[PDB]
Amino acid sequence: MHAALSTEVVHLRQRTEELLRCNEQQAAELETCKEQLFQSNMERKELHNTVMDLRGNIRVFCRIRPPLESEENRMCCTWTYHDESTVELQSIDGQQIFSFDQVFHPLSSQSDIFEMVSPLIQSALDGYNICIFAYGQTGSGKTYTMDGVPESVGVIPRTVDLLFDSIRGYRNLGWEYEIKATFLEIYNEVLYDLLSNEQKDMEIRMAKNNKNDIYVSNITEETVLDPNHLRHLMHTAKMNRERSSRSHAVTKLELIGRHAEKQEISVGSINLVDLAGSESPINRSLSELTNVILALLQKQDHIPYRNSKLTHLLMPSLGGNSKTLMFINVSPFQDCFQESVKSLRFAASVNSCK
Amino acid sequence: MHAALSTEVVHLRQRTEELLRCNEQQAAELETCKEQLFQSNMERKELHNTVMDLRGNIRVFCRIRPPLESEENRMCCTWTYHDESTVELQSIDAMGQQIFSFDQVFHPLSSQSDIFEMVSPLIQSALDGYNICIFAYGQTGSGKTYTMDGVPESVGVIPRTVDLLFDSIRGYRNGWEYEIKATFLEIYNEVLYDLLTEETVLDPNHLRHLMHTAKMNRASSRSHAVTKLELIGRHSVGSINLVDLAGSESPNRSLSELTNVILALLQKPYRNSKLTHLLMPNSKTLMFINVSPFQDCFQESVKSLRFAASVNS
Numbered sequence: 170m171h172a173a174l175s176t177e178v179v180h181l182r183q184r185t186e187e188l189l190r191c192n193e194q195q196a197a198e199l200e201t202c203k204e205q206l207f208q209s210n211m212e213r214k215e216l217h218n219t220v221m222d223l224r225g226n227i228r229v230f231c232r233i234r235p236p237l238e239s240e241e242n243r244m245c246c247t248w249t250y251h252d253e254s255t256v257e258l259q260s261i262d263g264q265q266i267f268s269f270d271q272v273f274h275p276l277s278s279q280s281d282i283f284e285m286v287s288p289l290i291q292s293a294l295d296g297y298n299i300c301i302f303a304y305g306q307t308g309s310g311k312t313y314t315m316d317g318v319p320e321s322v323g324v325i326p327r328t329v330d331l332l333f334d335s336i337r338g339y340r341n342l343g344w345e346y347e348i349k350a351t352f353l354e355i356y357n358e359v360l361y362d363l364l365s366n367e368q369k370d371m372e373i374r375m376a377k378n379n380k381n382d383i384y385v386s387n388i389t390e391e392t393v394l395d396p397n398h399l400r401h402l403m404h405t406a407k408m409n410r411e412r413s414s415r416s417h418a419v420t421k422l423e424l425i426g427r428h429a430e431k432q433e434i435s436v437g438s439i440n441l442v443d444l445a446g447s448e449s450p451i452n453r454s455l456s457e458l459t460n461v462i463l464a465l466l467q468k469q470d471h472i473p474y475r476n477s478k479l480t481h482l483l484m485p486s487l488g489g490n491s492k493t494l495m496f497i498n499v500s501p502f503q504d505c506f507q508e509s510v511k512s513l514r515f516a517a518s519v520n521s522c523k
Numbered sequence: 524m525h526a527a528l529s530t531e532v533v534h535l536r537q538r539t540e541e542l543l544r545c546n547e548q549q550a551a552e553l554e555t556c557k558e559q560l561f562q563s564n565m566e567r568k569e570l571h572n573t574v575m576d577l578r579g580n581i582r583v584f585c586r587i588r589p590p591l592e593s594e595e596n597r598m599c600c601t602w603t604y605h606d607e608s609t610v611e612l613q614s615i616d617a618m619g620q621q622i623f624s625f626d627q628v629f630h631p632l633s634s635q636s637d638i639f640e641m642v643s644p645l646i647q648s649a650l651d652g653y654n655i656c657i658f659a660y661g662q663t664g665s666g667k668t669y670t671m672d673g674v675p676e677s678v679g680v681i682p683r684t685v686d687l688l689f690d691s692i693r694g695y696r697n698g699w700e701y702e703i704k705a706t707f708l709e710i711y712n713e714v715l716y717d718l719l720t721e722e723t724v725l726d727p728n729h730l731r732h733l734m735h736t737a738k739m740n741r742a743s744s745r746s747h748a749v750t751k752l753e754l755i756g757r758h759s760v761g762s763i764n765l766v767d768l769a770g771s772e773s774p775n776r777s778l779s780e781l782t783n784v785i786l787a788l789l790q791k792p793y794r795n796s797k798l799t800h801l802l803m804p805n806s807k808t809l810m811f812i813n814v815s816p817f818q819d820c821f822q823e824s825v826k827s828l829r830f831a832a833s834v835n836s
């Protein structure tokens with residue numbers, strides 16, 4: 170029937186028009202709602218950075234680890250908690266008393282450490298560069314603090330979990346993030362790619378599009394596909410890892426946020442560093458690191474970032490906007506007393522610079 | 524013909540279903556977008572509270588009122604906003620402070636709800652144990668009373684606190700109970716009048732009554748309406764103080780002395796005033812700066828803003 174179809178047409182043209190009109194309203198609500206979300210996040214980002222700056226752009230923390238079941242009779246020096254931020258030790262045989270942004274004691278969980286770190290993962294997604302360092306003599310807690318242990322995982326694994334949850338969320342704002350992972354060791358001034366097997370030679374060079382950012386030649390830079398992929402690379406890296414005690418390990422995650430609708434990008438790094446041991450027998454990098462950090466604090470003209478591989482590697486995450494956490498790991502025992510004191514005296518130098 | 528318009532109906536069945544799916548994805552996107560916007564704005568407000576906590580015990584907000592029903596003919600000065608917290612006004616006829624930074628600047632279209640939203644945080648602090656002073660400053664005509672008390676149709680801050688403040692306490696009685704010594708008083712010329720003599724409260728509606736009492740029982744408007752709300756709790760001593768002040772315009776010694784007194788505190792001198800003693804606040808205080816958008820209130824606004832600025836020092 171022709172009248173049937175003539176009717177269906179006339180009816181579809183009515184419908185088609187009410188939809189076309191409705192879709193134009195939705196679109197126009199979307200456009201402004203899209204605009205107010207972008208701006209609101211811009212504002213949330215700035216309020217966040219301000220809270221980080223008020224707490225301090227570089228912050229030092231202490232963590233005395235528990236004793237080991239193994240040696241239930243290494244004598245521990247006398248530890249005394251003057252407050253939540255101040256700590257003192259005495260040898261068994263002046264006063265050794267040190268202030269920090271926070272002191273973590275032997276029953277502080279991994280979770281508790283991460284609480285100091287998780288806010289900075291956001292700073293990295295907002296486009297800032299972050300350094301988390303673990304410092305102190307061998308035995309003192311560094312590896313346990315950064316990598317940790319399957320039963321109680323450390324900073325790095327927690328960072329990854331938060332990174333994927335956070336990235337999932339960001340899609341709802343139009344941001345498509347991409348992580349670039351790299352793992353490397355540093356020994357006697359030479360870099361080693363822990364994702365490679367071939368022995369190759371890698372130098373640190375100025376970037377393509379920013380003379381202040383850094384570029385490492387001939388390193389494996391993996392674009393993470395999902396957590397499973399990262400999990401694999403993590404595992405792999407641990408595999409290729411008294412040399413280990415004198416090697417610095419740097420895990421780096423470069424967050425690369427593209428917002429196509431607005432054509433803005435947001436790139437921030439995370440630099441997770443299991444430093445080498447602070448014990449007197451590193452000769453170059455570890456000493457230069459400590460100078461570089463202290464110089465930052467004193468607001469000095471020029472800074473010898475290029476006097477060492479490590480300070481060169483981390484240069485774009487040490488000046489200016491970057492934020493920096495430093496976890497001083499310490500062993501409670503008496504035979505570590507003098508070395509523990511050396512460790513803690515960097516805390517003294519740090520806040521000696523105000 | 525049968526061929527022709529059978530082609531047509533198919534083509535339209537496509538555009539129809541095609542547009543319906545696109546209407547569908549839009550619908551969803553919008554629902555998502557609004558959720559996220561809500562969520563982003565909440566985090567923003569929580570950070571904004573943190574920032575004000577960590578940097579001092581004294582917040583300053585500025586509210587510009589919209590022109591009144593009966594004032595379409597009135598000439599407005601030019602208002603320029605740079606930030607959520609930065610505002611500038613220029614005279615209409617084309618040296619010194621002309622652009623001011625506060626903790627928040629509220630537009631003429633700011634609801635009584637949005638204003639209170641920013642004070643909410645300080646209320647719960649009082650339960651926690653602190654003394655809160657909420658001042659309203661400005662020239663007569665500006666917004667002090669409207670903002671503080673409000674009007675039966677769109678309630679102000681003083682009432683709104685009550686709502687939240689009970690929402691709070693039912694949460695606390697869940698091994699903690701709270702007594703609420705209330706207080707209401709005015710100040711004309713150094714004279715300590717009443718408005719009811721403190722009266723302990725035991726009900727949500729009980730307030731709204733004596734709240735309604737003092738209101739009508741109150742009054743020209745060149746007098747301070749203080750309103751203590753002392754709170755104690757036993758298993759948390761504290762207070763809330765809410766103040767609508769006398770006009771800030773040209774002659775009120777108490778105000779010029781209120782000013783003097785605050786230069787001292789921020790600078791870490793009383794009570795030369797009467798209000799100043801009464802309010803002896805370890806105490807988070809907030810201040811509203813009400814301002815009129817009109818060109819004949821220009822210099823007076825600049826008086827208020829420049830005063831608000833010095834406060835931020």
Ligand SMILES: Nc1ncnc2c1ncn2[C@@H]1O[C@H](COP(=O)(O)OP(=O)(O)O)[C@@H](O)[C@H]1O
Pocket residue numbers: 234235305306307308309310311312313314414498
């Ligand atoms: N917070 C802690 N809780 C329990 N065990 C810890 C803690 N910190 C370190 N350890 C243990 O102490 C030892 C110290 O080595 P580790 O800190 O992992 O590397 P490094 O000694 O090079 O800093 C490890 O065997 C680890 O099991």
Ligand SMILES: Nc1ncnc2c1ncn2[C@@H]1O[C@H](COP(=O)(O)OP(=O)(O)O)[C@@H](O)[C@H]1O
Pocket residue numbers: 587588589591631633661662663664665666667668669670744813
């Ligand atoms: N945000 C606002 N929205 C609408 N009207 C307002 C607003 N603020 C003040 N007004 C009106 O402007 C007038 C100014 O008086 P008001 O500010 O309430 O008392 P005071 O001048 O003592 O501060 C009132 O009539 C009030 O209703």
Ligand SMILES: [Mg+2]
Pocket residue numbers: 311312313414443
């Ligand atoms: Mg180690």
Ligand SMILES: [Mg+2]
Pocket residue numbers: 667668744
């Ligand atoms: Mg009034």
